[PDB]
């Protein structure tokens, strides 16, 4: 069980760690988060009390280094940093734990939620979507645009999700225009899975990462990507059975975790109605259809 | 974006553009079977592709053999239309290719967009105008070539005959749409108007009769009256 210490908390802020969150008051004696489960990526995220604008945060994996948070009064945010001195770090953590200045990652033992949301998400793939190679952790905020959003403006601060565009030469074989547009199996299986992602695990990892960026930072481009990757599968007549069954599990836990009060903005009515009721896979997503119909029957 | 009354003069500027109307591509007669069910029989159709500035009409005849063994023919017809328009563009010299293609039905937008991906600089546009191009098969010489076709065929016409020697393309288009609207609203009466006088004939190389300027004013008035007459008969006014 690993630890992310905080140097201090000089400004009032709501701090998220994965699907949990807690409020810290201005100059409260808060020195970090302990008991973080090893084996998963994690995200530590922030919303300042005095300016809700720019929810931002850091994706990290405690197996890759010792990370801590320190407020920067010049740039006005909580920054993640790596401590290379292992003995310095162990000594800082132990002192803060002894003084009980840390919140405990509050995982219920029965609860597989975070695993289910990050099953296919790997740090190495996050760091290719979010390019900042001198850090082992990845910064994401509310306003960062995607490579596709920029094509339709700073490239170093972009989310390099895989571009999906149903009306593009990549998606449409010359001479198979009608076939490929109405049945996207070629695009899914040859172009995307065999060609770009290599396997369904990397595809699901990007899908899951896009969802989590939408939920945690209100990143519109991330939501656009999440929906595009669902639609591409649902609009394919030929999908491996194991992918459909896994997709149903992935989406079920995403819909289950979504704050009820942000359904209006996080869920695209067209995509979901198409996917659940018109698409080739309208009958393949039983768990997802059931939770959507009982939780968000308005959208449908 | 879409083409409407506000930007109507754009049709007659010097940027090459084509209207595409797919309403006569897939044509059927519905009939009873011996067992008392219903079946369709396809008949030859056509794509109506028109340059409104010059009157050049690219009439691609759709022979019933293209439907043989195919399913979901109303959907296929839109994609076949887009395929044939794309093939026409590719067949034209670069300096004759359109800069815009305006589809008369919004359901042609995605099929044509997808078929024209190789031409990102050609705009594919809808229109808010209700154009009467479905009535093209009320023009006897066009109906005749479509029905006689035994194989796929493209036939080129000028739908304005020689009108542009005497009038502008704005006026020619207005005349054409009035004629077609009349043929669409009451075909029998419209054709009566157009031929009632045997001394005015259709030249071998034309589609419409050889009316003088003064005779066109009379004809045009008679077509407006017909459209108004039918509008009253319809709504009881
Ligand atoms: C505030 N916000 N949140 C989202 C989403 F990520 F949940 F999809 C989109 C927007 B927006 O339009 O600015």
- List, in sequence order, every residue forming a beta bridge with B28; answer none if it has no partner: B42
* DSSP conformational letter for A157: G
Q: Are A5 and A92 in contact (CB under 8 A)?
A: yes
Separation of first and last alpha carbons in chain B: 37
Answer whether A38 contacts ligand 1 (Cβ < 6 A): no
Task: Give the single-character DSSP code of A260.
Answer: G
d(CA A102, CA A3): 9
Task: Tell me how far the alpha carbon of residue B195 is from its chain's centroid.
Answer: 21
Which fold is adopted by the domain B164-237?
Answer: Acyl-CoA Binding Protein (1.20.80)
- H or E element in which residue A127 lies: helix A123-129
Report whether A264 contacts A221 (CB < 8 A).
no
The DSSP bridge pattern shows strands B153-158 and B56-62 to be: antiparallel
Helix A241-257 × helix A286-295 angle, to 10°: 20
> Which residue of A177, A183, A235 is the best one to mutate when testing the B interface, meaning the one whose CB has the most B CBs within 10 A?
A177
Q: Which two tokens stand for residue A89?
A: 């770090």
B72 touches chain A (CB under 8 A): no
Counts of helices then strands in chain A (DSSP H, E): 12, 10
**CA separation (Å) from B207 to A198, B18, B179?**
60, 20, 12
Method: X-ray
* CA atoms of A185 and A200, how far apart (whole Å): 14
Question: Ramachandran region of residue A100, left (φ > 0), alpha (ψ -120 to 50) or beta?
Answer: left
Beta-sheet strand order (sheet of B45-50) = B123-125, B100-103, B17-21, B45-50, B56-62, B153-158
Contact yes or no for B23/B107 (Cβ under 8 A): no
Ligand 1 pocket mutation pick from A55, A209, A219, A254 by most atoms within 8 angstroms of CB: A219
For domain B9-163, the CATH superfamily is Prp8 RNase H domain, palm region (3.30.420.230)
Q: Which are the residues after which chain A is interrupted (C to N > 2.5 Å)?
A: 152
A214 C-beta closer than 6 A to ligand 1: yes
Nearest by Cα to B177 from B215, B133, B218: B133
Q: How far apart are CA B77 and CA B23, in angstroms?
A: 9
CA distance A109 to chain B (A): 51
State the maximum Cα–Cα separation within chain A, in Å, rounded to a whole number: 70
| Cα(A15)–Cα(A216) distance, integer angstroms | 11
Order the strands of the A42-48 sheet from edge to edge.
A20-24, A13-17, A42-48, A56-60, A138-141
Pocket test for ligand 1, best of A45, A223, A259 (most atoms within 8 A of CB): A223
Q: How many CB atoms lie within 10 A of CB B130?
A: 8
The domain over range A116-299 is classified in CATH as 1.25.40.550:
yes
For residue B118, the Cα-to-chain-centroid distance in whole angstroms is 26
Each as own residue / partner, the long-range contacts of residues A179-183 (CB below 8 Å, 24 or more positions apart, any chain) are A181/B110, A181/B111, A181/B114, A183/A235, A183/A236, A183/A237, A183/A238, A183/A280
Structure tokens at A234: 């649902």
Q: Where are the domains of chain B?
A: 9-163, 164-237
Beta bridge partners of B30: B40
Q: Round to whole Å and give the CA distance between A141 and A55.
A: 6
Are B172 and B220 in contact by the 8 Å Cβ rule? The answer is no
Which of left, alpha, beta for A172 (phi over 0: left; psi -120 to 50: alpha)?
Answer: beta
8 Å CB contact between A238 and A180: no
Distance, CA of A281 to CA of A237 (rounded, Å): 7
As for chain B, the residues directly before each break of C–N over 2.5 Å are: none
Chain B environment of A174 (Cβ under 8 Å):
118
DSSP state of A63: G
C-alpha A211/C-alpha A116 separation (Å) is 13
Chain A within 8 Å of B79 (Cβ-Cβ)?
yes
Q: Which neighbouring-strand residues pair with A71?
A: A78
- With a 6 Å cutoff on the Cβ, whether A223 touches ligand 1 is yes
Resolution in A: 1.5
Q: Give me the DSSP letters along chain B.
A: --B-STTGGGGGSSS-EEEEE-TTSSEEEEEE-TTS-EEEEEE-EEEEEE-TTT-EEEEEEE-GGGGTT-S-HHHHHHHHHHHHHHHHHHHS-GGGS-SEEEESSGGGHHHHHHHTTT-TTSEEE-B-S---GGGGGGSHHHHHHHHH-SS-EEEEEETTTTGGGTS-HHHHHHHHHHHHHHHHH-HHHHHHHHHSSTTS---TT-SS----HHHHHHHHHHHHHHHHHHHHHHHT-
CA distance A78 to A68: 10
From residue B214, alpha-carbon distances to A21, B36, B202, B210 in Å are 84, 55, 17, 11
Please list, residue by residue across A79-89, b when 16 or more beta carbons sit within 10 angstroms of its beta carbon and e when fewer do. ebbebeeeeeb
CA distance B45 to B61: 6
Q: Within 10 Å of residue A189's Cβ, how many Cβ atoms? A: 17
Strands B17-21 and B100-103: parallel
Could you identify the atom of ligand 1 that is nearest to the CA of residue A217?
Answer: 6
CA A142 – ligand 1 centroid, Å:
8
From A145's Cα to the closest Cα of chain B, the distance in A is 24
Spatial contact of A19 and A50, defined as CB atoms under 8 Å apart: no
- Write out the two tokens for A164: 């999906």
The span from the CA of B19 to the CA of B27, in Å, is: 20
Length of chain A: 300
* The two domains B9-163 and B164-237 share their CATH topology (first three levels equal): no
CA–CA gap between residue B99 and residue B101 (Å, rounded): 7
Residues in chain B: 237
- Check if A186 contacts B (Cβ < 8 Å): no
**H or E segment and range at residue A299:** none
Q: How far apart are CA B186 and CA B181, in angstroms?
A: 9
Tell me if B111 and A167 make a contact (CB, 8 A cut-off).
Answer: no
């Amino acid at each position: 069980m690993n630890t992310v210490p905080f140097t201090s908390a000089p400004i009032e802020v709501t701090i998220g760690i994965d699907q949990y969150s807690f409020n810290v008051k201005e100059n409260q004696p808060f020195h970090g988060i302990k008991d973080i489960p090893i084996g998963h990526v994690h995200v530590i995220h922030f919303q300042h009390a005095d300016n809700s604008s720019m929810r931002y945060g850091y994706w990290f994996d405690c197996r890759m280094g010792n990370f801590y948070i320190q407020y920067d009064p010049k740039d006005g945010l909580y920054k993640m940093m790596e401590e290379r001195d292992g003995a310095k770090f162990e000594n800082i953590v132990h002192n803060f734990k002894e003084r009980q200045m840390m919140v405990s990652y509050p995982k219920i033992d029965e609860d597989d939620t975070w695993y289910n949301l990050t099953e296919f998400v790997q740090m190495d793939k996050i760091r290719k979507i979010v390019r900042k190679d001198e850090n082992q952790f990845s910064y994401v905020d509310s306003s960062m645009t995607t490579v596709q959003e920029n094509e339709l403006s700073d490239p170093a601060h972009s989310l390099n999700y895989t571009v999906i565009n149903f009306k593009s030469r990549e998606a449409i074989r010359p001479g198979h225009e009608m076939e490929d547009f109405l049945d996207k199996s070629y695009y899914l299986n040859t172009v995307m899975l065999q060609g770009i992602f290599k396997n369904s695990s990397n595809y699901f990892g990007e899908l899951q990462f896009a969802f989590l960026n939408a939920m945690f930072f209100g990143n519109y481009g991330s939501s656009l990507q999440w929906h595009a990757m669902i639609e591409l599968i649902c609009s394919s007549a030929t999908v491996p059975k194991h992918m459909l069954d896994k997709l149903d599990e992935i989406l079920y836990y995403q819909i289950k975790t979504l704050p009820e009060q942000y359904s209006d903005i996080l869920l695209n009515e067209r995509v979901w109605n198409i996917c659940l009721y018109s698409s080739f896979q309208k009958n393949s997503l039983h768990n997802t259809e059931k939770i959507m119909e009982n939780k968000y029957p308005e959208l449908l | 974006g879409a083409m409407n009354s506000s930007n109507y003069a754009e049709l007659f500027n010097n940027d090459i553009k084509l209207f595409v109307d797919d309403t006569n591509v897939y044509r059927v007669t519905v009939h009873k079977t011996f067992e008392g069910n219903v079946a369709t029989k396809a008949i030859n159709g056509c794509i109506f592709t028109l340059n409104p500035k010059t009157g050049h009409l690219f009439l691609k005849i759709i022979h019933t053999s293209v439907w043989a063994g195919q399913k979901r023919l109303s959907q296929l017809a839109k994609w076949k239309t887009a395929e044939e328009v794309s093939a026409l563009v590719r067949s034209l010299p670069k300096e004759e290719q359109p800069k815009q293609i305006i589809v008369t039905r919004k359901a042609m937008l995605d099929p044509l967009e997808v078929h024209m991906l190789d031409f990102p600089n050609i705009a594919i546009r809808p229109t808010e105008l209700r154009l009467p191009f479905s009535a093209a098969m009320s023009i006897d010489k066009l109906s005749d070539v479509v029905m006689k076709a035994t194989e796929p065929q493209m036939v080129l016409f000028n739908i304005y005959d020689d009108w542009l020697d005497r009038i502008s393309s704005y006026t020619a288009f207005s005349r054409l749409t009035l004629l077609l609207r009349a043929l669409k609203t009451n075909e029998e009466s419209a054709k009566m108007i157009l031929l009632s006088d045997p001394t005015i004939t259709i030249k071998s190389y034309h589609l419409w009769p050889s009316f003088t300027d003064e005779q066109w004013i009379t004809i045009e008035s008679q077509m407006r009256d017909l459209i108004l007459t039918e509008y009253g008969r319809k709504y009881n006014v």
